Amino acid sequence: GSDLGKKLLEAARAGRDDEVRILMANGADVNAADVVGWTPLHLAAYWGHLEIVEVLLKNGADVNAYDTLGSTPLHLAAHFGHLEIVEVLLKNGADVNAKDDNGITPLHLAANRGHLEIVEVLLKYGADVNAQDKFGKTAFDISINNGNEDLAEILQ
């Protein structure tokens, strides 16, 4: 990360749209890593800042950048129920079958926290429903363990 790159991470995390827009003008590194490997896109996706997600992708931010444990921004967006950020990320060419170091996809995370609409959008963009984690558990297996019959109907 650069001197500006640090201020973009803090600004992207915070939700200050105006500060990001000026840092985009001043040529701040859009692919500036955290200590754990989170780009500004990760931080925006996690804390749910639609404005900054769109502005960062516009300035050639890596949509399939992964942290030290292999988690993409689509994981963070899907996991924490940020619907329109999952839409924007998938539209700008996010890997819907992105496996972290545990073999967990965005479909697994979305299924587990029970965000029904995100699961449908992920499936629409071609999410692998048969995909397994390191333990050998599908998105369907997560739904029956949680007892989510609404979710269980979809995943088949």
């Binding site: 001197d3 640090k6 915070a14 200590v35 754990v36 989170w38 030290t68 988690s71 545990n102 390191k134």
Partner: protein
Amino acid sequence: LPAGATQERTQKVLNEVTHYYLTKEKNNVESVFAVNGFGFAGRGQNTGIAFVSLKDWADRPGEENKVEAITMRATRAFSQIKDAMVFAFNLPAIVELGTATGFDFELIDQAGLGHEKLTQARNQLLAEAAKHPDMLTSVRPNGLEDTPQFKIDIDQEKAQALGVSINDINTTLGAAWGGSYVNDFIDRGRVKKVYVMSEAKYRMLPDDIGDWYVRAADGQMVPFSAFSSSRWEYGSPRLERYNGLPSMEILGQAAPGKSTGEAMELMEQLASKLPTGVGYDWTGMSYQERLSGNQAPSLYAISLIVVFLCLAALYESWSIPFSVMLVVPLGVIGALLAATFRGLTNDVYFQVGLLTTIGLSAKNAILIVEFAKDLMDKEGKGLIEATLDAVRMRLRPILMTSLAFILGVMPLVQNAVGTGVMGGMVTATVLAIFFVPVFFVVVRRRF
């Protein structure tokens, strides 16, 4: 230092801070007590304080070598530092109280909103406070921000399948990585603790988690990676509470010219526009100085009523008292000019200083009026005759005390404070010898 900043990094800043003070302030600084690990906003590897001990008052001559001056120079040189937010500040006059200027605001989660929602309600108040520089300044949170942490989930099914108890897993993890206090031993006739913990180089990065083995019921040694799965998430490294409920302490002060009372009234208005289930309360000095304000007018009121009543019994008159009591501003104005000109501040010493000047100028006036009134009562003299005889008889002793004072104060002419009570008594004497005669005649003519 920022989130995920190590102890080795925090020391390098403290090294450069200590290097500056013993180099560029070798004339002023005696020692630097560098404490990596502790902070007055929070604790951790990423925080430190440097307690700077200075030399004698004598070895630091002039205002350029005082704390206020060194503080401003220090902060400028530390603005250069890359991955740090370093700044010097003077200790408060009374260490027991604390900062003792501005306000202390507690933002309270009143309806189980959670940590992440109170974080935003705070950020909404901080953003609003920034849009009134004319009223509020230095409105900041007195606590640590959320940091990355290493979430690790134990697959209960996988652990039961391989025949590994959760007790053994959590203990192996907590004891190795966290450190575990086992029992006490006796080192040379003194009781001391025994801690088991991982050797540093096997408990640093997530790669090291895979190197830890828990024994199963069947006898097999199961690695930690077989039944674990880890990811990153953001959690608070310092949670605050106030009167049982979750809170966030906000510090600030009134903008230059504005009173601290006004600043609090705006903070109350801004707070009432926050999301539902977000309350607030005033703690510390704000709690103290709000208790002071209510009492002030009541005690001012009692002072004057008792003064008036005591003079009324003395002189046997409801009106004549006023002739004495009108002397208050004459004693006050001298001190105010002396303060404003040389550039002193209205502090608690200066205030008791005014009360003594008012007290002594009142003392001088009480005798002038007493002598004047007695001449009219006993010897049946006229108003102007009695006033002129009174002020003559009382001229010497007033000038004797006033000469003793200005001779007593002028050794200070340390030079700044030397004109404070000097100027306060000069005008108090000069005015009162001319104005008290006026007050007595004006009052006795009217009433």
